[PDB]
Amino acid sequence: ALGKLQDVVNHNAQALNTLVKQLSSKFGAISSVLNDILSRLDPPEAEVQ
Amino acid sequence: FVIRGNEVSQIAPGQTGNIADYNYKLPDDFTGCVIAWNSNKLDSKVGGN
């Protein structure tokens, strides 16, 4: 009966979760953690990552 | 300045090395040209320069 309102809530949380999940994406880089990239590479390639 | 044959890679921005860290440091945003040429004829001696 109350599918529409719950759907809106369902979309909003899912969107935030997806955005949060996007922080765990390498995006074609060696790691998704900035601290690891700084701790492991020189600034010419760390800047690229 | 004068350096070794193998140390010419260390005269670059963002490099980890001994002469890079403790002798001559380049900034990350460096613009310009590095010129390197052999000086065995002038900067070397048989007894050790």
Contact at 8 Å (CB) between B26 and B12? yes
Closest CB to B15 among A42, A46, A47: A42
Reported residue count of chain B is 49
Contact at 8 Å (CB) between B13 and B27? yes
Q: How was this structure determined?
A: cryo-EM
* B28–A contact, CB cutoff 8 A: yes
Distances (CA, A) of B9 to A4, A25, B6, B43: 64, 33, 7, 20
Q: Alpha helices of chain B — where are they, by DSSP H?
A: 18-22
User: How many whole angstroms separate alpha carbon B34 and alpha carbon B49?
Assistant: 24
Instruction: Measure in Å the smallest separation between the Cα of A38 and chain B Cα atoms.
Output: 12
3-class DSSP state of B35: coil
